UniProtKB/Swiss-Prot annotation:
Residues in WH1 domain copies: 5-113
Organism of origin: Mus musculus
Subunit description: Tetramer; this tetrameric structure is critical for forming the high-order complex with SHANK1, which in turn is necessary for the structural and functional integrity of dendritic spines. Isoform 1, isoform 2 and isoform 3 encode a coiled-coil structure that mediates homo- and heteromultimerization. Interacts with GRM1, GRM5, ITPR1, DNM3, RYR1, RYR2 and SHANK3. Interacts with IFT57 and OPHN1. Interacts with SHANK1; forms high-order polymerized complex with a mesh-like network structure, at least composed of SHANK1, HOMER1 and DLGAP1; the complex formation is SHANK1 multimerization dependent.
Modified residues (N-acetylglycine): G5
UniProt free text on domains: The WH1 domain interacts with the PPXXF motif in GRM1, GRM5, RYR1, RYR2, ITPR1, SHANK 1 and SHANK3. The coiled-Coil domain forms an antiparallel tetrameric arrangement.
Top-level taxonomic group: Eukaryota
Name this protein carries in UniProt: Homer protein homolog 1
Signal peptide residue numbers: none
Its job: Postsynaptic density scaffolding protein. Binds and cross-links cytoplasmic regions of GRM1, GRM5, ITPR1, DNM3, RYR1, RYR2, SHANK1 and SHANK3. By physically linking GRM1 and GRM5 with ER-associated ITPR1 receptors, it aids the coupling of surface receptors to intracellular calcium release. May also couple GRM1 to PI3 kinase through its interaction with AGAP2. Isoform 1 regulates the trafficking and surface expression of GRM5. Differentially regulates the functions of the calcium activated channel ryanodine receptors RYR1 and RYR2.
Protein family membership: Belongs to the Homer family.
Compartments, as annotated in UniProt: Cytoplasm; Postsynaptic density; Synapse; Cell projection, Dendritic spine
Gene: Homer1
Length: 121
């Protein structure tokens, strides 16, 4: 399974929040309004990733790794930390139901990546 295509694997609408520890360790928004996130899979690295474009510049560009863990900040708000980007990104949801789908599907991708790296080196 490789070279599937340039199309995304999954997408969803949610608010974009980027941590700003440079000035103050606290939650800080990046997008004034909710945006659509896109999922992609790298055949070379055999792992999934999350990329989101806001306007003319990308804001989210993390990779789903087997060592990452999803953290819930609210009933309808989820976030995660990316070592590669050395930051924390969070997606706000209007309903806990939407958040549940996001978190559950996120874990599913994580398990897939783990199996892929296990079989490969």
């Amino acid at each position: 399974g490789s070279h599937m295509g340039e199309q995304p694997i999954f997408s969803t609408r949610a608010h974009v929040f980027q941590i700003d520890p440079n000035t103050k360790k606290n939650w800080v928004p990046t997008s004034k309004h909710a945006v659509t996130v896109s999922y992609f899979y790298d055949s070379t690295r055999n792992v999934y990733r999350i990329i989101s474009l806001d306007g003319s510049k990308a804001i989210i560009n993390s990779t789903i790794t087997p060592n990452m863990t999803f953290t819930k900040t609210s009933q309808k708000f989820g976030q995660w930390a990316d070592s590669r980007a050395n930051t924390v990104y969070g997606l706000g949801f209007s309903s806990e139901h939407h958040l549940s789908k996001f978190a559950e599907k996120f874990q599913e991708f994580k398990e897939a990546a783990r199996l892929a790296k296990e079989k490969s080196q």
